[PDB]
């Protein structure tokens, strides 16, 4: 098994896709050209959590009593408290959509990041040596496509709220007048506001992507370079630090989503 450090660290970049056109698993050595090649490792594994989310919340929501709650119910109410105490501070419009939307984003993004705290090679090890197939990486958040998909979705919601809540007549007045509120500036104002709009989803997604990709790649490094008995001294502190980041990314994403949506709807 001639894995060199420079090579082992290169293999880790590779997803296990399947050609949409030809139902072919795309082999790592040659990457086919097309837009029709699903990343299977970050998609099924992403909805793994999409399901383990509902199935871990639905299994209380029906059961609860407003009396003294159990410990699991105590944690669930603590998380609903965090979320709702956040949302109530900044969105005054009572539109139902924003309230459970933040819950999904927070919990789901936290779960996506959480996978990365397990050692890197182990899931690929099992998934290749038993199931044979040529590739595996296990952090949905470290695939740009998921992040920019969520960004595009919230971007749709932004524009919808802008329409519904102040219409095209307000939307156009804003995009034309701001910031200077006079005709002589407008042809420049028109570019600025669209740029700002596009930046919101762009930044929202790319912040998370970069954070998690860079956090993963450190573990990718040390597990192949240092003398294997020593790797703990620089794998451990990094994870110790990393937990704070995976949580903060979910928090930031949730709160900025709330903020921008409120900013459009109010």
């Amino acid at each position: 098994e001639n894995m060199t450090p420079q090579d082992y660290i290169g293999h880790h970049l590779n997803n296990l896709q399947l050609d949409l056109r030809t139902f072919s698993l795309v082999d790592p050595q040659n990457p086919p050209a097309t837009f029709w090649t699903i990343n299977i490792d970050s998609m099924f594994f992403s909805v793994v959590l999409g399901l383990l989310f509902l199935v871990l919340f639905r299994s209380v929501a029906k059961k609860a009593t407003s009396g003294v709650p159990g410990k699991f119910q105590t944690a669930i109410e603590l998380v609903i408290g965090f979320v709702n105490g956040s949302v109530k501070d900044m969105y005054h419009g009572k539109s139902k959509l924003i309230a459970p939307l933040a819950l999904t984003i927070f919990v789901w993004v936290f779960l996506m990041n959480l996978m990365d705290l397990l050692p890197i090679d182990l899931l690929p090890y099992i998934a290749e040596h038993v199931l044979g197939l040529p590739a595996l990486r296990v952090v949905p958040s470290a695939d740009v496509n998921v992040t920019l998909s969520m960004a595009l979705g919230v971007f749709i919601l932004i524009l919808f709220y802008s329409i519904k809540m102040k219409g095209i007549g307000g939307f156009t007045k804003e995009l034309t007048l701001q910031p200077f509120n006079h005709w002589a500036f407008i042809p420049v104002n028109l570019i600025l506001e669209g740029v700002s709009l596009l930046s919101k989803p762009v930044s929202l997604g790319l912040r998370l992507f970069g954070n998690m990709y860079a956090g993963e790649l450190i573990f990718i490094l040390i597990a192949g370079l240092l003398p294997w008995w020593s790797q703990w001294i620089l794998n451990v502190p990094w994870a110790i630090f990393h937990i704070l980041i995976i949580t903060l990314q979910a928090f930031i994403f949730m709160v900025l989503t709330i903020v921008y949506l409120s900013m459009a709807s109010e």
Binding site: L20, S46, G50
Partner: protein, 52 residues
């Protein structure tokens, strides 16, 4: 990196999980907590109404 149609695929699962939680989970727990709050608020309120 080279973008992929998965950016289109993932959005569907996202919106589906939103559609589900939105109705199957949230109002349920909203009631499950609001009821617990109201039952205490009303207890102390009625007790003040008694003392007055």
């Amino acid at each position: 990196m080279n973008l992929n149609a998965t950016i289109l695929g993932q959005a569907i699962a996202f919106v589906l999980f939103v559609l589900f939680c939105m109705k199957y989970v949230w109002p349920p727990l909203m009631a499950a907590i609001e009821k617990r709050q109201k039952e205490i608020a009303d207890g102390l309120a009625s007790a003040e109404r008694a003392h007055k």
